[PDB]
Amino acid sequence: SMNPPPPETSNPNKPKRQTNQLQYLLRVVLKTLWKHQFAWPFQQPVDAVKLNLPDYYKIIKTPMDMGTIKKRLENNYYWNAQECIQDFNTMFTNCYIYNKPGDDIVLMAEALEKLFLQKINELPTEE
Ligand SMILES: CC(=O)Nc1ccc(C(=O)NCCc2c[nH]cn2)cc1OCc1ccccc1
């Protein structure tokens, strides 16, 4: 069985910024979801070998996880908040696409997404 390489977390030629909105996405949004009791399945790329999901990367073509998002925020990979918000939404959408309604992993994603939406609602205005 085979995993793909992880999503990109380093690209020197990609333009980057350090902004109050991206600081908020690390200090509030990522840290709030990361410490949650249901974070663990989302803290690293899906290991389709370990988890015996041989069709995962046949169905999910834009994989994303909070481990990757944490690295992107900590290594100042993003230009804007919308890029980072898209990564979170990709992660949740992948979970709902691959899994069945009422699956434990879907209930876990839904709990994290509720907190995500609460925090994004209070995204501060750009300085
Ligand atoms: C991020 C994500 O979607 N992860 C997972 C997806 C599918 C399964 C999984 O095992 N699904 C059941 C087997 C299945 C269904 N369709 C194909 N294989 C387990 C997963 O993460 C580990 C886990 C296991 C149990 C509770 C919480 C997290």
| For ligand 1, mutation pick of 49, 95, 104, 105 (most atoms within 8 Å of CB) | 105
Domain contains 50:
yes
**Method of determination used here:** X-ray
Resolution in Å, one decimal, please: 1.6
Q: Are 76 and 52 in contact (CB under 8 A)?
A: no
Q: How far apart are the first and last CA of the chain?
A: 47
Two tokens at 62?
Answer: 């834009």
Two tokens at 101?
Answer: 């309604």
| Three-class SS state of 3 | coil
| Three-class SS state of 83 | helix
Nearest to 105 by CA among 61, 55, 45, 41: 41
Cα separation of 33 and 113, whole Å? 9
Counting runs of H as helices and runs of E as strands, what totals does the chain give?
6, 0
Domain contains 1:
no
* Cα 46 off chain centre by: 11
Domain contains 7:
no
Q: In this structure, what CATH number is given to the domain that contains residue 26?
A: 1.20.920.10
Domain contains 92:
yes
For residue 108, give the ligand 1 atom closest to its CA: 27
Looking up tokens 């979801």 gives 33
Pick the residue whose CA is nearest to atom 18 on ligand 1: 53
Q: Are 106 and 95 in contact (CB under 8 A)?
A: yes
Count of domains observed in the chain: 1
Pick the residue whose CA is nearest to atom 2 on ligand 1: 95
CA angle 90, 43, 49 (to 5 degrees): 85
Cα separation of 119 and 106, whole Å? 20
Domain span at residue 116 reads 19-123
